[PDB]
Write a protein that binds this DNA or RNA. Structure first.
Length: 54
RNA sequence: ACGGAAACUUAAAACCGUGUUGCACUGCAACCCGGAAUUCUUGCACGUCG
């Protein structure tokens, strides 16, 4: 299980960033990089916002 | 001392005067600046309480 290694605030929480583009962006077009906005596979489901209540 | 010997066919005079290369005539009739392209794909108002 991967950790959040670092002493300063710049490198405490940063492993939520560099791991979020490792096994999560695998759509794999032959002309675009994986590690950006296009090649995501987490764009599968499409959330609809909840209605208004009392 | 040859019907011989002398003599300019000569002087002047404007081929000039009147007269539009002119009058009628569309550079005109017909046409689309017209057809096919997602403003898009990654993203939690939250860490923080002796």
């Amino acid at each position: 299980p991967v950790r959040v290694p670092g002493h300063q605030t710049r490198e405490h929480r940063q492993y939520g960033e560099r791991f979020e583009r490792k096994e999560l962006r695998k759509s794999g077009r032959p002309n675009t990089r994986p590690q950006d906005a296009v090649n995501d596979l987490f764009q599968a489901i499409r959330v609809t916002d909840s209605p208004g209540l009392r």
